[PDB]
């Protein structure tokens, strides 16, 4: 135990660091528990993790943090799956601890550089889409329906003013709708909308599939049809498949949208499992240009994520949930996607909270195209107001009410 | 550190569960060092749960200092000390103390230490003058018996 | 019927007065209710109290007026499910019942009295007990407490 | 809610059923919570789930079960990933419930028949390996250069184990690259087979960062004549696992599934996904062997062991089986017992798991071949004793001691 807990160790620039929160079984000292985590997760005296710091969680009993370093040599270059089996494979099942949660990881530059990172990244993605100076908009199509009627709904919404339209995350290929036709009809909807409006529009076609070969076939067809972006569920399908698709995307010029379905299974409970900020970092290394992060309208933790997936360098700040300073070594960021419970009344806040480098995915308008219209107007009004100097967290009500008089579509939305 | 009568409904802002284990002054530091720190109201029954059983239980209505304590909550009976029996005796006392705030940091704040016989309350400055940077508990409130007149 | 005041979340901010009752449970049974200390001696300053008998379980209740009125003879009975005890509708939640053994005699026709049922412990209307000629009960229910709700 | 909770509904033979446990936020009725689970996990008239039964968890305050039916059409044929996003995608994040756990799934025959199932299964595997009448044995090498690793493999297999396993955390690292491990291990196998006349193998880890690398590793193992390969299905993902399973059938290679990281989502009893669900999902996806872990809550463990081996399992709540599951002649999966086991537990393991199992052991006083010998002897002694009607739960001490009189290796083990 004393061969793992080493209170006087300074981490190296090449070490992978991890921060765990745990609650020891009664009778088990915090230090012994920390040593045990390092042992279970590692081993040859250069192949063992070291626990270098243990401290209590302020305000909680039987709740501690432990900081563990792991030598660079233990991790397969370019592989998220190897990092995860090493760090989270068996520590969670360890008997001397009641509960265990992984809060954070510092990826050393030496390891960051072995990963592809996002296919295109935020700046490239804006250039490809030719969209600047604002957040992007989209929505999910309801009913969540034949391929022809589905295509019509997509057309109307994109034509109406949204940048993106999304497939329900649970529909891959079903007896009532087969992917090959959804892809054809959606592509038509996009092409007509683009031709008519002069803008670039896409649709998050779901290419999630039961096998790798099928995943590629779906992705290849989306490319054949000229689709700029595709969607994938990185947690259910997993990282081997996600990484594979990301590589394909970079080679082929297609943007990749990552959905976070099933994350709740892993991180909802505050005292066990893996915090999403860890998964978010892992994804940035694996691939993905867009990532669902969800909205807030814990705020501090949310802001933490957003910087971690977008900035080149993030200073440690425990009040924001960041345990370790993280240098991304010029790897591009991932554009966050806000969602859940949002409509135009929240537009002010969403613009101020996330800034310009984001996508807002909206839910029901009383009049499809009028919906797109109401959100397009509300967003532009909010962005312009922000640039002028209005405070969106206070004046947001007036900004929307005034905007509502320019376009009755927005008034109709605001009226409810 | 307020001194409050046990009086009903003076402030109208709410009504809920709060418990502190009781010690007698005569008992001394040993009783304080042994009283259960974590008293957790839960389930839905709301019967309070203590990490360990305690003989005497008193609650202090959830006034703001009492609510603030959380862990380390303790209540200390104090008994007087009349030179003349005919002169009215001082009332029995109780001290709500935060054992979690054992360290002496505030000069104004009173802290619980040990008298030659029983326990005593001493100013933080006095304790620092005596070079004691530690105390058993930090007194957060003062006592006074329910007076209907 | 039965007066029901529900304990609520966030009520811990500023209770000016609070009262203490021993706790008995449905599983523990009638014997526990007889065993519970009836006289709680108030030598209180801002609350200091002693009990005639040592008791393992205590519930801290706010000084709601019906609970405050009881004084001696006050007990709280824990029920896993509200429906079985309540003659009326239930929300499938744990029930806390405050009973005064001093008024156990059945004189109030509409008054509810805790009694030993064959299944366990039940709250019964006084008129119903009078129909069965039951002159005495475990305790007279004063208040029913429901859990905090988010 | 009245469109989701229907107390008088009888499930159809083609419905998928799921059993959930939950604890509703205070002030939330159980029925309302149940209806919500059904809505969140399905559309929310033939595309919606229905909650048909709600009951309290005996002995547990504010804890309920809910039974929900889902129409066959909501699931993509042959796809585990689709079934999971539909059922566990976002219901776990639902606000009116404090916690949610999935206990069981009934897969209707109509859906079971769209899946491949295990590449070979229990009976085929015994025939391919020509091993009958007993559990199979193996171990993990504790420590090395590829050649040193190969020597350790040789000695262990040569000494009497059927299988040797790669550490689950070693894929490819600067200190050892997979291609060399594969060559030296294969040589060790070939020498041991030639010298003993039996069939021996090694669970080569082919878990990889991409599907292409996964295939390269699997193909190389095939070229070298390796009868079995290993994969981490939870870390790698179901898309990758399914892909490998199809490959395995075509190429005649047995597939061993490791369960690392399962603790992340199934350890706590009030949140997440019970292992038995994952076990069923895996049987449908693929894999011939699955780690079950040891028992030396045996009731719950045995429950899923039958679910993954038997053709027809009657519901029995005392064993954690909520629904009757008809596997429609799909082959079963061998359980693998592991962790915390040694010859002392051999009696128990044989009686508990029967013959259709693999026992994996973690050193022996006289090195690896004596190690292997001691386990081989202990197992054969236990099986033969069982066949004579000896009660292994009581006589096990004598069965091992008697065996120790003819085998110095076993005796050396029993000495400790």
Swiss-Prot record, chain A:
EC number of the protein: 4.1.1.39
Signal sequence extent: none
Cofactor(s) for this UniProt protein: Mg(2+)
UniProt keyword annotations, A-Z: Bacterial microcompartment, Calvin cycle, Carbon dioxide fixation, Carboxysome, Disulfide bond, Lyase, Magnesium, Metal-binding, Monooxygenase, Oxidoreductase, Photorespiration, Photosynthesis
Catalysed conversion reaction: 2 (2R)-3-phosphoglycerate + 2 H(+) = D-ribulose 1,5-bisphosphate + CO2 + H2O; D-ribulose 1,5-bisphosphate + O2 = 2-phosphoglycolate + (2R)-3-phosphoglycerate + 2 H(+)
Result for mutant: residue 32 to A/C: Does not form the RbcL8-(RbcX2)8 complex
Transmembrane segments: none
Comment, domains: Binding of RbcS probably induces a conformation change that displaces RbcX2 and triggers the final mature conformation.
NCBIfam families cross-referenced by the UniProt entry: PRK04208.1 (NF003252)
Record-given protein name: Ribulose bisphosphate carboxylase large chain
Organism: Synechococcus sp. (strain ATCC 27144 / PCC 6301 / SAUG 1402/1)
Upper classification of the organism: Bacteria, Bacillati, Cyanobacteriota, Cyanophyceae, Synechococcales
Swiss-Prot record, chain C:
Recorded superkingdom: Eukaryota
Subcellular location: Plastid, Chloroplast
Plastid recorded as keyword: yes
GO biological process: ribulose bisphosphate carboxylase complex assembly
C-terminal beta sheet as annotated region, ranges: 2-148
A single GO cellular-component term on record: cytosol
Record keywords, A-Z: Chaperone, Chloroplast, Coiled coil, Plastid, Transit peptide
Main function: Required for assembly or stability of RuBisCO. Acts at a postchaperonin step to fold and/or assemble the large subunit (rbcL) into RuBisCO. RAF1 brackets an rbcL dimer (rbcL(2)), leading to rbcL(8)-RAF1(4) complex formation. In the next step, RBCS displaces RAF1, thus resulting in holoenzyme formation.
Domain notes: Has 3 domains, the N-terminal alpha-helical domain, an extended flexible linker and the C-terminal beta-sheet domain. The N-terminal alpha-helical domain stabilizes RbcL dimers and RbcL dimer-dimer interactions, facilitating RbcL(8) formation. The C-terminal beta-sheet domain probably dimerizes Raf1. The 2 C-terminal beta-sheet domains are swapped and pack against each other to form the dimer interface.
Stated family: Belongs to the RAF family.
Subunit field text: Homodimer.
Protein name: Rubisco accumulation factor 1.2, chloroplastic
Gene giving rise to this polypeptide: RAF1.2
Residues shown, of full length: 287 to 436 of 449
């Amino acid at each position: 135990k004393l061969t793992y807990y080493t209170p006087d160790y300074t981490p190296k620039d090449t070490d992978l660091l991890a921060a765990f929160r745990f609650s020891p079984q009664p009778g088990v000292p915090a230090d012994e528990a920390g040593a045990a985590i390092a042992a279970e997760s590692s081993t040859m005296d250069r192949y063992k993790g070291k626990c270098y710091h243990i401290e209590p969680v302020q305000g909680e009993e039987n709740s501690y943090f432990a900081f563990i370093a792991y030598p660079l040599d233990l991790f397969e270059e370019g592989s998220v799956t190897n990092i995860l089996t090493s760090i989270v494979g068996n520590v969670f099942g360890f008997k001397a601890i009641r509960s265990l949660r992984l809060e954070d990881i510092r990826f050393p530059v030496a390891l960051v550089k072995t990963f592809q990172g996002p296919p295109h990244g935020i700046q490239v993605e804006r250039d490809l889409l030719n969209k600047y100076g604002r957040p992007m908009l989209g929505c999910t199509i309801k009913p969540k329906l034949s391929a022809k009627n589905y295509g019509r709904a997509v057309y109307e919404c994109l034509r109406g003013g949204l940048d993106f339209t999304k497939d329900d995350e649970n529909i891959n290929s079903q007896p009532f709708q087969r992917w090959r036709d959804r892809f054809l009809f959606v592509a038509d909807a996009i092409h007509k909308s683009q031709a008519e409006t002069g803008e670039i529009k896409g649709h998050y076609l779901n290419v999630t599939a039961p096998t790798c070969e099928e995943m590629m076939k779906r992705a290849e067809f989306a490319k054949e049809l000229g689709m700029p972006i595709i969607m994938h569920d990185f947690l259910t399908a997993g990282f081997t498949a996600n990484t594979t698709l990301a590589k394909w995307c970079r080679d082929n010029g297609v943007l990749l949208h990552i959905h976070r379905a099933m994350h709740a299974v892993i991180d909802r409970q505050r005292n066990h499992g893996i915090h999403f900020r860890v998964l978010a970092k892992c994804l940035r290394l694996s691939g993905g240009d867009h990532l669902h992060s969800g909205t807030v309208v814990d705020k501090a933790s949310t802001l933490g994520f957003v910087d971690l997936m977008r900035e080149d360098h993030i200073e440690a700040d425990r009040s924001r949930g960041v345990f370790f300073t993280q240098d991304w070594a010029s790897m591009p960021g991932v554009l966050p996607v806000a969602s859940g419970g949002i409509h135009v009344w929240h537009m002010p806040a969403l613009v101020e909270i996330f800034g310009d480098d984001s996508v807002l995915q909206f839910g029901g308008h009383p009049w499809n195209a009028p919906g797109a219209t109401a959100n397009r107007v509300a967003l532009e009004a909010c962005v312009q107001a922000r640039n002028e100097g209005r405070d969106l967290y206070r004046e947001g009500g007036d900004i929307l009410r005034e905007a509502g008089k320019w376009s009755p579509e927005l008034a109709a939305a605001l009226d409810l | 550190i307020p001194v409050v009568r046990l009086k009903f409904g003076e402030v109208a802002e709410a009504t809920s569960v709060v418990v502190l284990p009781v010690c007698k002054a005569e008992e001394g530091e040993k009783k304080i060092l042994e009283a259960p720190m974590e008293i957790i109201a839960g389930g839905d029954f709301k019967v309070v749960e203590a990490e360990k059983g305690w003989k005497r239980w008193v609650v202090l209505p959830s006034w703001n200092p009492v609510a603030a304590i959380g862990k380390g909550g303790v209540a200390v009976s104090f008994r007087d000390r009349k030179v003349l029996p005919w002169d009215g005796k001082e009332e029995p006392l109780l001290v709500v103390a935060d054992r979690v705030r054992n360290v002496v940091e505030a000069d104004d704040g009173y802290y619980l230490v040990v008298a030659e016989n029983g326990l005593k309350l001493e100013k933080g400055s006095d304790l620092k003058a005596r070079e004691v940077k530690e105390s058993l508990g930090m007194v957060v409130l003062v006592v006074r018996p329910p007076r209907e007149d």
